Amino acid sequence: SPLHFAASYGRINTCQRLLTRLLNEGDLHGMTPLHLAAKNGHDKVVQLLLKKGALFLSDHNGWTALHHASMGGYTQTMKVILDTNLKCTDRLDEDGNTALHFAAREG
Amino acid sequence: LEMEILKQKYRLKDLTFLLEKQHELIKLIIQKMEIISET
Amino acid sequence: LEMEILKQKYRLKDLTFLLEKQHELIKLIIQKMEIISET
Numbered sequence: 001s002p003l004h005f006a007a008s009y010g011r012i013n014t015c016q017r018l019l020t021r022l023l024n025e026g027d028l029h030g031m032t033p034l035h036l037a038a039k040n041g042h043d044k045v046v047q048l049l050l051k052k053g054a055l056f057l058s059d060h061n062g063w064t065a066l067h068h069a070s071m072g073g074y075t076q077t078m079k080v081i082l083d084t085n086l087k088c089t090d091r092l093d094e095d096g097n098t099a100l101h102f103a104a105r106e107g
Numbered sequence: 108l109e110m111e112i113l114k115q116k117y118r119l120k121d122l123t124f125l126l127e128k129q130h131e132l133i134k135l136i137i138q139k140m141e142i143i144s145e146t
Numbered sequence: 147l148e149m150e151i152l153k154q155k156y157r158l159k160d161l162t163f164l165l166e167k168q169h170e171l172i173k174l175i176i177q178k179m180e181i182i183s184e185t
Binding site: 142 | 162173176180183
């Protein structure tokens with residue numbers, strides 16, 4: 001819960017102090033700390049979580065951290081995501097949408 | 108009516124810009140805020 | 147209709163004034179806020 005809150009709200013100093021069953025654990029919606037940090041647009045928290053060996057997972061709806069960063073239009077978080085693993089760009093959600101679909105739909 | 112509508116559109120654009128700045132500031136407040144008793 | 151457009155413009159001006167006051171207040175919050183754990 002504290003790690004999820006800190007990732008979701010960009011409190012990086014708390015994230016560094018709190019840090020792998022905790023790095024890749026979701027909540028009742030399946031969102032890992034990377035998912036929440038990408039969703040709220042904290043590219044530094046995402047970068048730190050990735051350097052600690054967090055894996056690009058999928059939540060209950062199949063969205064990736066890149067899916068959540070594209071829905072919010074966080075270009076810096078997306079750059080951080082794309083410069084580490086060039087294999088999450090074309091992942092498919094439950095309805096068959098990609099990160100490009102969400103970015104185009106959200107304007 | 109067109110002049111009034113365009114002026115209102117400009118006002119709405121300025122309001123949107125200010126509200127986005129405010130949103131970023133509030134996010135920064137949450138980032139830097141002390142949470143002790145309500146952790 | 148002129149009436150509706152002008153009343154809307156008055157409402158939008160009041161909204162802009164209130165949002166500017168809110169923005170100044172949030173800036174003051176950041177000015178006076180305690181930053182220890184997230185410094």
